[PDB]
């Protein structure tokens, strides 16, 4: 049951446009997964009406 019923699963390199690169084991064919955003370059990971009248006058 742990033989030729499961999908193929081997080593896979992941790179980001920020410059991040690390090495996992995934199911992408060829092992060349490329992301546009990751855990290093995303926001949330690093970050009155009285003044409206004052700005007009």
């Amino acid at each position: 049951m742990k033989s030729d019923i499961h999908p193929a699963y081997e080593e896979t390199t992941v790179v980001c446009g920020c410059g991040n690169t690390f090495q996992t084991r995934s199911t992408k064919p060829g092992g060349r997964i490329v992301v546009e955003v990751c855990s290093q370059c995303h926001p949330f990971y690093t970050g009155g009406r009285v003044a409206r009248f004052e700005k007009r006058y």
Binding site: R49, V50, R52, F53
Partner: protein, 83 residues
Amino acid sequence: PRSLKKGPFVDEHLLKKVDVQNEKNTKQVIKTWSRRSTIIPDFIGHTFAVHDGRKHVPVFVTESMVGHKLGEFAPTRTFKGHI
């Protein structure tokens, strides 16, 4: 008066009624008919009896109604529903 070149519009008879109370720090109600007056940030905390057509309606200027006209809080018409 609605264009930024000429400032906002408050009636002069309404500006004199709060400047006699901003000088001695009291919060008496201002009976008024001036629905067309802008709320400015010297009306904060003041209450106003604002005429709607048939009676005067109290309105309490808090902080966020400070770019609006004063008549927007006394509704003139009345409609509960057809049935």
